[PDB]
């Protein structure tokens with residue numbers, strides 16, 4: 001086993017707060033914000049050796065990243081930013097930093113009770129998205 005095991009499985013979105021405002025801060029345009037904010041994604045997290053895979057499946061888009069902790073990779077986000085991403089495991093929290101155009105956003109994923117809580121931060125603006133097991 002791995003500590004990273006508490007994240008493995010299939011998760012469904014149960015609540016969102018401030019996601020439109022987070023997307024505005026990131027620079028997402030109107031139409032994409034409207035359709036992406038309507039989405040009710042599933043997150044599917046799996047581990048195979050050192051490689052972690054995070055898939056997001058919804059009616060808006062299906063995305064998949066695979067990565068090794070601490071090792072930078074290029075990511076095309078669902079809103080079509082070309083970013084440089086690094087994901088680390090800090091005190092039990094997956095911390096995902098995306099860099100592009102001199103900007104930065106951080107997405108933290110953590111286990112809290114039976115939920116997986118995703119916190120997305122762009123300067124002063126935080127969105128909190130709560131998932132539970134499917």
Ligand SMILES: O=C1CC(CC(=O)Nc2ccc(Cl)cc2Cl)=NC(=O)N1
Pocket residue numbers: 022023026028032033036043056077078079107118120129
């Ligand atoms: O693993 C995650 C990551 C995340 C941030 C995100 O989804 N960003 C994003 C997604 C689509 C679009 Cl159009 C624009 C942006 Cl900023 N929220 C989540 O519930 N789970």
